[PDB]
Design a protein around this ligand. Structure first.
Ligand SMILES: Cc1cc2nc3c(=O)[nH]c(=O)nc-3n(C[C@H](O)[C@H](O)[C@H](O)COP(=O)(O)OP(=O)(O)OC[C@H]3O[C@@H](n4cnc5c(N)ncnc54)[C@H](O)[C@@H]3O)c2cc1C
Ligand SMILES: Cc1cc2nc3c(=O)[nH]c(=O)nc-3n(C[C@H](O)[C@H](O)[C@H](O)COP(=O)(O)OP(=O)(O)OC[C@H]3O[C@@H](n4cnc5c(N)ncnc54)[C@H](O)[C@@H]3O)c2cc1C
Ligand SMILES: c1cc(-c2ccc3c(c2)OCO3)n[nH]1
Ligand SMILES: c1cc(-c2ccc3c(c2)OCO3)n[nH]1
Ligand SMILES: [Br-]
Ligand SMILES: [Br-]
Ligand SMILES: [Br-]
Ligand SMILES: [Br-]
Lengths: 487, 489
C-alpha cells in the first residue's frame, strides 16, 4: 500500500497533463494508472491515451498518406509525368510506419516517468474502492487479482471514451476505429457507419488505399453528414467526397449484418437495401468509459447520458474526486482534455482556481479536403442573437483548375453578431483549413469584429487571405429566420 | 479628336492602381481612367493589365512553386507506402509554363471585360506620363518623343507604375536575365545561377531545382554572409540548410564580377573572389527599383526620395497637391496587398470623406521557398533596439510526418517575440509547410494587440503545426537592454 497526493486513472491526454503538472509544478506525489504500456491489441488505448495510440496521432499520419493519391494525380497538371499504371498504395508499409511512430511515443512516455520525481506509473485496471483508495487489478473484472492499493488525497478520473456499438443482430461482425488501425490488409469494399468525423476521416483513408476494383461506402441515418458543422461545408464536403469515388448513403441505417461464406459481410439496412462489404466499421459515436471504475462504491453521480457529472472546475459530487476529458461527455478533443487537466491541478494544488473555457474552441476534421472551424455555426448563433450576418466566399482555387480537381471548392464563412460586428464563428473547408484556423481561435479571444479581419492586410497568394476580404454579408438571420436582406 | 476628362487618372493598371480605380468608380461614382502598356502578360513589357503580381509576380510564381513542390511530394509518398516506377518520373517544364500562361491570360481577359462593362472606369493602352498638373499624356512608347495617343485631363492623378528589376553594371550583364524572362524560358535550365539573397532568388532557386533536367544543378549566390536579410535569423539559417539538403548549392559572400560566353554558348561566370561557375542561365534578382524614369515627373515637380521612390506622406500625397503615389513606386514595402490597401485608403480619403492611412506595421507576409516562411511584425534584434526587455518563445523540431517521409531536414520553426514588460506580441516568425496560411490570422491578432497570454490561453487544434503557437508559455531567452541572455538577471 502506497500514499499519494494525486492518483490519476488513465494515462491519457488529460491524465498525463494533470499528473506531470502536479508533480513538476507543485512538487506533489502522483500515481498514474493505465492498462497497457504501448499501443494496439488487446486494449488499443494505452500509456499516452487514445489520441496518441488509436486517435489523432496515427489517423493524421494515415490521412497524410491518403492525400498522396490526390498529389500523384494532381501533379500531372503541373507537368509531372510518370507511369501511372505502376502506382500502388502499400497499406502494410503505412501501418508499419504508423506503428513505429506510435511505439516511439509510448517509449518516450516511459522514460518520462522514469526521469520525473513524484510521478509513478502503475500497470492495470484502476477502480474506486473507497473515497480515498484506488485499487489496481489484473483485468477489468472487479474480482481479479489486486496488484496495488493506492491511497489518495485526490483522485482524478480520466479514462476517456470508447466506441459505441448499436444493438443490432450481427454487431459482432463489425469493427470500430480501434481495429481499423491494425487491419492486416486494406479492405477492398468497406462500409463506414456514421456521419461524424471518424467515419468521414476513415472513409478518406480507405478510399486511397483500397485495392483495384475497391469501393468505400459511408452511410448515415439522417439526411446530411457531419451534424454540428457548418451546413454549407457539410454539403460541400459531401460533394467533394463523392467526387473522389466515395458513395455517401444518407437516410440509411444498418439493421443487421451476417457472415457470407467467403468471409465478407452482408449488411441489411432498415430500408431493405443490402450491401456486401469486406469490412463494416461502426463510427456512430463514442461514450464515456465509466463501467470498470466501480463508481457505485463511492457514489459518483453520472449524467443521464452517462458522463461523470462535473462542475466547471471538474469536481464530482464526491469531495476530492475529479473528472476531466472524454469521460465528462462534453467536447471530446485532446487539447480540451489537456486544458481541463491543467486547470484542475492549478485549482487544487495552487493558489488560483482556473476553469476551462469550452466556447470558441478551434478544431478540425481531416477529411480530404479538410475542415477547420472555431465558434458558432449560424443556426446556433441565430437562436442566441437577434441579428446575425453570414459572410461567405466559395470558389475553386486557381491551382485546382490546373490540377484537374475542379470540384475542390474552398469555403470560408464568418458568422457575426450583426448588431456590433462581433465574430461569432469562422468555418473553413479546403487545403490548409486546420492550420488557417488556429490563430482565428486567438482572434475570438480578443473579441475580434468582422472589420478587424477586413482591415488586416492580406498575405497573398493564400486561401487564408479570403478571411480578410469579406466586407458585405451574403445573408442574415433576423429573429431566427434566414433572409438575404435586412428588414 | 478630343481629349477626355476624368476625376481620377491612374497610371499603371496594377494591384494598387486597379483597386483605387475600381473603388473610385463603383463606390463613389467618379469618372476614372486607367493606363497600362499592354493588355496581356509577357514580352515585350512583361507586366501588363493587372500589374506585376498578376502577370510576372505572385500569381505565376505561386503556381510554379506549387508545381515544384511535387518533386518533394513524389519522393515523400514512399514513406507512406506509395510505390511507382521512379525511373519514369519527368518534370515537363513546357507543360508548367503553358498552364501558367493560360491561367494568367484568363485573368488578363477578365480585367479587360471589367473595363468594357463598368460605368466610369475606362482603360487606355499606352505609356502614361505627366505633362502638367492636370494632364496625363498617353504615348505609343516610353520615349517622350513617341506619338501621342491620348491626352487625359485629370482633377487627381495616381502614380502606380510599380517597380522593375535592377541589373548590376558588370561586363557581360547582357548575357543575364531577370525574373521577367525566367517566366518564359522555353526549356528548364540544366545549370542556373540565381544571384540575390532575397525572396525572388530563393523562390526561383526552388522552382528551377524541381524542374531541372537530368544532371542539373541550381546554384544561388549571395554577396553577404546569410541569405534573406530582414527575416528571422533562426529562419534564415534553417532555410539555408533545407535548401542545401534539397540539392541547391548556396554560395554566400560571393558576387559575380563578369559573365562571358563559352565557345559552346554556356555562360562563364567569374566571381570577385576569382571562383568560376559555368551555367546555362544567370538570373539576376538583386533588387527591384521604383519605376519613375518614364513618368517625366520633372514636368510638374514631383519630388523623389534620395533612394529613387516617389516621396509621399502617410496619406500617399506627393508634394504636388492633387498627385498621389502608392505601391512599389513609393519604394517601401513592395507587397501586393499593401499596394491594394494604400489604393483603397487613398480613394476613401479623397472621394469618400472618410480619411484613412495605411498601417505599414505588423504586415503579414510570406516566402514561398520550399519549405515556406510566414511572418508578421518585428524580428527580435529590431525589437531589442526599441524595447528594454524582449522575450523570445521558440519551438523548432522535425514534425513527425517528416520522420516518416524521410525529409528529416524539414524542421518546423515557430517563434514569438514579445515586449516582456507587458506581454504584447511584437512579431511571429514561422518556417515550414503551411506557414503562409497559418500567419494570416496572426496578422489580425497583432492588429488587435494580442499578448503572449492570449496565444497561450487559446486551445490548440491538434495535430497541427499551428498549435505550437498556442503552447508556448516560458521564454526560451531574452534581450535586456539589447543583450541576449537565457535568463533575466
Ligand atoms: C479515431 C479517433 C481520432 C481522433 N482524432 C482526434 C483529433 O484529430 N484531434 C483531437 O483533438 N481529438 C481527437 N480524438 C479524440 C481524442 O483522442 C480524445 O478526445 C482524447 O484522447 C481524450 O483524452 P482523455 O484524457 O479523456 O483520455 P484518453 O486520452 O482516452 O486516455 C484514457 C486512457 O485511460 C486508460 N484507461 C481506461 N480505463 C482504465 C482503467 N479502468 N484503468 C486504467 N486505465 C484505464 C486507457 O487505456 C487510455 O489510455 C480522436 C479520437 C478517436 C477515437
Ligand atoms: C517575381 C515576383 C514575385 C512576387 N511575389 C509576390 C508575392 O508572393 N506576394 C506579394 O505580396 N507580392 C509579390 N510581389 C510584389 C508585387 O508583385 C508588387 O508589390 C505589386 O504588384 C506592386 O503593385 P503596384 O500597384 O505598385 O504596381 P504593379 O502591380 O507592378 O503595376 C504597375 C503597372 O504599371 C504599368 N506601367 C508601368 N509604367 C507605366 C507607364 N509609364 N504608363 C502606364 N503603365 C505603366 C506596368 O505595366 C504594370 O502593370 C512579387 C514581385 C515579383 C517581381
Ligand atoms: C491506387 C491508387 C492509384 C493511383 C493514384 C494516383 C495516380 C495514379 C494511380 O496514377 C496517376 O496518379 N493507383 N492505385
Ligand atoms: C526530377 C525529379 C525526379 C524525381 C522526384 C521524385 C521522385 C522520383 C524522381 O522518383 C521517386 O520520387 N525525377 N526527375
Ligand atoms: Br448513423
Ligand atoms: Br441531418
Ligand atoms: Br521540359
Ligand atoms: Br501566459
Amino acid at each position: 500500500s502506497k500514499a499519494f497526493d494525486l492518483v490519476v486513472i488513465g494515462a491519457g491526454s488529460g491524465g498525463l497533463e494533470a499528473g506531470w503538472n502536479a508533480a513538476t509544478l507543485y512538487g506533489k506525489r502522483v500515481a498514474v494508472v493505465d492498462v497497457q504500456t504501448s499501443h494496439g491489441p488487446p486494449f488499443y488505448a494505452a500509456l499516452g491515451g487514445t489520441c496518441v495510440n488509436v486517435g489523432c496521432v496515427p489517423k493524421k499520419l494515415m490521412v497524410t498518406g491518403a492525400q498522396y493519391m490526390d498529389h500523384l494525380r494532381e501533379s500531372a497538371g503541373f507537368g509531372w509525368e510518370f507511369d501511372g499504371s505502376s502506382v500502388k498504395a502499400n497499406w502494410k508499409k503505412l501501418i508499419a510506419a504508423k506503428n513505429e511512430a506510435v511505439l516511439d511515443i509510448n517509449k518516450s512516455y516511459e522514460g518520462m516517468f522514469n526521469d520525473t520525481e513524484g510521478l509513478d506509473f502503475f500497470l492495470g485496471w484502476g477502480s474506486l474502492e473507497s473515497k480515498n483508495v484506488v485499487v489496481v487489478r489484473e483485468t477489468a473484472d472487479p474480482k481479479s487479482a489486486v496488484k496495488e492499493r493506492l491511497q489518495a488525497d485526490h483522485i482524478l478520473l480520466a479514462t476517456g471514451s470508447w466506441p459505441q456499438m448499436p444493438a443490432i443482430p450481427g454487431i459482432e461482425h463489425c469493427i470500430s476505429s480501434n481495429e481499423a488501425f491494425y487491419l492486416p490488409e486494406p479492405p477492398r469494399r468497406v462500409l463506414t457507419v456514421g456521419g461524424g468525423f471518424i467515419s468521414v476521416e476513415f472513409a478518406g483513408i480507405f478510399n486511397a488505399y483500397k485495392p483495384p476494383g475497391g469501393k468505400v461506402t459511408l452511410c448515415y441515418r439522417n439526411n446530411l453528414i457531419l451534424r454540428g458543422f457548418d451546413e454549407t461545408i457539410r454539403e460541400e464536403v459531401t460533394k467533394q467526397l463523392t467526387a473522389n469515388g466515395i458513395e455517401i448513403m444518407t437516410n440509411e441505417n444498418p439493421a443487421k449484418v451476417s457472415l457470407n461464406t467467403d468471409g465478407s459481410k452482408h449488411v441489411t439496412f432498415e430500408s431493405g437495401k443490402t450491401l456486401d462489404v469486406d469490412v463494416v466499421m461502426m463510427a456512430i459515436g463514442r461514450i464515456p468509459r465509466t463501467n470498470d471504475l466501480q463508481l457505485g462504491n463511492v457514489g459518483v453521480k453520472l449524467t443521464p447520458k452517462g458522463g461523470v457529472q462535473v462542475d466547471e472546475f471538474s469536481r464530482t459530487n464526491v469531495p476530492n474526486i475529479y473528472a476531466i476529458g472524454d469521460i465528462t461527455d462534453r467536447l471530446m478533443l485532446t487539447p480540451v482534455a489537456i486544458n481541463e487537466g491543467a486547470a484542475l491541478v492549478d485549482t487544487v494544488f495552487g493558489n488560483k482556481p482556473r476553469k476551462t473555457d469550452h466556447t470558441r474552441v478551434a478544431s478540425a476534421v481531416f477529411s480530404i479536403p479538410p475542415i477547420g472551424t472555431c465558434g458558432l455555426i449560424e443556426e446556433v448563433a441565430a437562436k442566441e442573437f437577434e441579428k446575425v450576418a453570414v459572410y461567405m466566399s466559395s470558389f475553386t482555387p486557381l491551382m485546382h483548375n490546373i490540377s484537374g480537381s475542379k470540384y475542390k471548392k474552398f469555403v470560408a464563412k464568418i458568422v457575426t453578431n450583426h448588431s456590433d460586428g462581433t465574430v461569432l464563428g469562422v468555418h473553413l473547408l479546403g487545403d490548409g483549413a486546420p492550420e488557417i484556423i488556429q490563430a482565428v481561435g486567438v482572434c475570438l479571444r480578443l473579441n475580434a469584429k468582422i472589420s478587424d479581419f477586413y482591415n488586416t492586410i492580406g498575405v497573398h497568394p493564400t486561401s487564408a487571405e479570403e478571411l480578410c476580404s469579406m466586407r458585405t454579408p451574403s445573408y442574415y438571420y433576423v429573429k431566427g429566420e434566414k433572409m438575404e436582406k435586412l428588414p
